[PDB]
Design a protein around this ligand. Structure first.
Ligand SMILES: CN1Cc2ccccc2NC1=O
Length: 119
């Protein structure tokens, strides 16, 4: 029932994401010189370095807020892809499946801890 445990669990999951080859396109903000129409399509850019910096600054209150920003990385990739068969988008689908498999217990434990605090 530790209300604070989610933070270190999210730091460890971000470390695993950075080691995976499938994160390479998503580690830093999308390069606008490479993709000059990116901001005509994508209203709110997001990347894993931004997520980690937000966490380490103490600017997430819950793992739900971190989970919203990570899902935005994947939805932006889907909106920018010319094909569902693209390389970068296919890396995004494997990395999304890995993320969802590991964040499920972080969310469940946090929400259980809050309910116990309010019992
Ligand atoms: C082919 N692309 C290009 C791309 C650039 C930046 C972010 C996401 C994507 N998605 C794609 O599938």
């Amino acid at each position: 029932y530790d209300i604070q445990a989610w933070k270190k669990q999210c730091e460890e999951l971000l470390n695993l994401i950075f080691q995976c080859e499938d994160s390479e396109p998503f580690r830093q903000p999308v390069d606008l010189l490479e993709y000059p129409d990116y901001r005509d399509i994508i209203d709110t850019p997001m990347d894993f370095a931004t997520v980690r910096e937000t966490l380490e600054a103490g600017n997430y209150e819950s793992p739900m807020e971190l989970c919203k920003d990570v899902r935005l990385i994947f939805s932006n990739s889907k909106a920018y892809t010319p094909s569902k068969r693209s390389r970068i988008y296919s890396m995004s689908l494997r990395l999304s499946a890995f993320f969802e498999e590991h964040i499920s217990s972080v969310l469940s434990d946090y929400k259980s801890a809050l309910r116990f605090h309010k019992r």
